[PDB]
């Protein structure tokens, strides 16, 4: 009933990162909790916007129906991510249907809450704007000066930030299909494989649905080398 | 203006408005030259405008606290700066000054505040698109990179083009480490990228660089060493 170590974990999505410290813990307060099972829907394409969603605990795959009639995957989520804030605030009907690919906790935000504070006052809205205008430049930023790494070295990474801690040893949940984490990570499914074929050496063990880091440091160190 | 207007359209602040206010918006702006080494602004001033550069670079710098200049950012043709700290009404935390002659075309705040506590939707319609960008950004900072330096070097080049065929020259700072610091390379390594692209018809003189073939320097930066 608290939702404490829940909410500390909302506050590391975008969503909640972007807003003015004074008006996180009002909002949090209207929160819709909910849980899901592997293979649940959280909604469908085309579907009445309701709320931003930020994922608890678990993996959401969001994906498109193709002309054809096939699910293009658009999207994985996982713990401390949010997503759907731009389509909540247009007010358009969901572009993608979403899925819990494992068990997992979601922490919506109704549309209505968010978007009436916004149209209560525009201080907020122009005081968010400004953060997010400063975490764009930020980005970009980033983006040019990302220099090339390797596949293992992107996926000690990934892992890496699916910890937390810094230091000790580790479990990750993942989904079983690995082809989720690959569309993510910009890479060839074998690649992955082949990357994590390479990380056993660096005390990483993958089975089908969870991951083990025997150390984070020589992992961290893995990750941070030539 | 309308070149100079087709130019600002490129902004990261132009692009994130609706399509439809733009142009009022546009009809507010104050055009300025600067001439090298003219300042902008300076650190503690009153942020009263946006900037979007529309020739030339700016470099924005910070005092260290022994009294040297620290580079904290340089940009270039279609790129805005300065759009929190006026949206949040705060000083200036840097200075900015032109490293080339330039223009630029400023924004007043005013015009762009008022207008959103005229019409909050005018914001709740910007923030959708900015938070869409957001994700777009953190989604391609999540997808693995392979890229060399000198293809790296190559498709900076390229975005500073704005063609798709053919030969241009680009104006570039004087000091190459400007350029190096953008794309968080060793300056060292900078000069060995430029020396690698002189075989995809890449040379780089003292105010400028010449393309000679866009899509053969498209080719080296699409690549995965190499010839023509
Ligand atoms: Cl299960
Ligand atoms: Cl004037």
Same mark, same amino acid.
């Given at each position: ?27 949090? &307060?209207? %929160? !819709?909790?909910?849980?899901?099972? /592997? +293979? *649940? ?28 009639? &096939?699910? %293009? !995957?658009?999207?994985?989520?996982? /713990? +401390? *991510? ?28 109704? &549309? ?7 149209? /209560? ?106």
């Amino acid at each position: 009933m608290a939702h404490e170590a829940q909410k500390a974990i909302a506050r590391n999505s975008l969503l909640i990162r972007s807003l003015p410290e004074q008006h996180v813990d009002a909002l949090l &307060s209207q %929160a !819709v909790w909910r849980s899901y099972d /592997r +293979g *649940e829907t959280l909604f469908l394409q085309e579907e009445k916007a309701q709320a931003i969603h930020v994922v608890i605990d678990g993996w959401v795959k969001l994906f498109r129906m193709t002309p054809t009639g &096939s699910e %293009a !995957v658009v999207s994985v989520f996982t /713990r +401390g *991510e949010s997503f759907g804030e731009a389509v909540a605030l247009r007010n358009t009907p969901y572009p993608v249907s979403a899925e819990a690919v494992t068990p997992c906790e979601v922490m919506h935000i109704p &549309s209505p809450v968010f978007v009436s504070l916004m149209r /209560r006052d525009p201080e907020i809205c122009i005081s968010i704007l400004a953060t997010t205008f400063g975490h764009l430049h930020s980005l970009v930023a980033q983006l040019e000066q990302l220099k090339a790494q390797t596949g293992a070295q992107r996926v000690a990474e990934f892992l890496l930030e699916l910890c937390d801690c810094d230091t000790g040893a580790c479990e990750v949940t993942l989904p079983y299909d690995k082809m989720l984490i690959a569309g993510r990570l910009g890479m060839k499914p074998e690649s992955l494989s082949r990357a994590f074929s390479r990380l056993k050496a660096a005390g990483v063990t993958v089975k089908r649905n969870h991951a083990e880091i025997e150390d984070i440091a020589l992992l961290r160190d893995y990750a941070e080398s030539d």
